Amino acid sequence: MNIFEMLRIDEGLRLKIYKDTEGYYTIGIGHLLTKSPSLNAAKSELDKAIGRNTNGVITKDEAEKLFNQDVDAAVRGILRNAKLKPVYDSLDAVRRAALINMVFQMGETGVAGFTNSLRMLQQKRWDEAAVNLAKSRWYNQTPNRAKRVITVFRTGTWDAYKNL
Ligand SMILES: [Cl-]
Ligand SMILES: [Cl-]
């Protein structure tokens, strides 16, 4: 298992514009297009992202390309963030994947906000960080996905994703 396979499981793959869990226009593998309520604005951001007149539909190759860009950006956002970088550097390879997943979902800003949890992860207090991560809107709104990510932080293994 790896970060790409992990996120492909959590986000799924859709080739036509759809609405995410928050009701925002998205496409591909969890690629947020716009927070705006307008489908046109969404089609416009899609075309600009792909570089062609899409008609709200993309191919698999195009979806994967946005995905690759998005994972790359997630990583870079972590390494440039004063609060995230040190956590990420302190973690083992499996747990780093869990942090990337959170950033991909909620953005760097969002994750950097989990101050207490971050400190606990940095300290390697797994069970305690897991309980603290669960006390969040994130966990209450997307519980199955949050449980998966939290279990990875708790155990350092990919067991939570094996079966899916
Ligand atoms: Cl883009
Ligand atoms: Cl969920």
Swiss-Prot record:
Catalytic activity: Hydrolysis of (1->4)-beta-linkages between N-acetylmuramic acid and N-acetyl-D-glucosamine residues in a peptidoglycan and between N-acetyl-D-glucosamine residues in chitodextrins
CDD domains to which the protein is assigned, alphabetical: T4-like_lys (cd00735)
SUPFAM superfamilies linked to this entry: Lysozyme-like
Result of changing residue 20 to E/Q: Loss of 99% of enzymatic activity
pH dependence, record text: Optimum pH is 7.3.
Chief site of localization: host cell
UniProt-reported outcome of changing residue 26 to H: Facilitates transglycosylation more effectively than hydrolysis; covalently bound substrate
Domain of life where this protein originates: Viruses
Known outcome of mutating residue 11 to Q: Complete loss of activity
Compartments, as annotated in UniProt: Host cytoplasm
Catalytic site positions: 11 (proton donor/acceptor), 20 (proton donor/acceptor)
Effect of residue 11 to A/F/H/M/N: Complete loss of enzymatic activity
Alphabetical GO biological process terms: cell wall macromolecule catabolic process; defense response to bacterium; peptidoglycan catabolic process; viral release from host cell by cytolysis
Listed result of changing residue 20 to A/N/S/T: Complete loss of enzymatic activity
Record's keyword terms, sorted: Antimicrobial, Bacteriolytic enzyme, Cytolysis, Glycosidase, Host cell lysis by virus, Host cytoplasm, Hydrolase, Viral release from host cell
Positions contributing to substrate binding: 32, 104, 117, 132
Cellular component terms per the entry's GO annotation: host cell cytoplasm
Induction profile: Expressed late in the viral replication.
Disulfide bonds: none
Leading EC class: hydrolase
GO MF annotations in UniProt: lysozyme activity
Entry keyword Cell membrane: no
Protein function: Endolysin with lysozyme activity that degrades host peptidoglycans and participates with the holin and spanin proteins in the sequential events which lead to the programmed host cell lysis releasing the mature viral particles. Once the holin has permeabilized the host cell membrane, the endolysin can reach the periplasm and break down the peptidoglycan layer.
PANTHER family cross-referenced by the UniProt entry: T4-TYPE LYSOZYME 1-RELATED
Family the UniProt entry places it in: Belongs to the glycosyl hydrolase 24 family.
Name under which the protein is recorded: Endolysin
Species: Enterobacteria phage T4
Designated gene of the protein: E
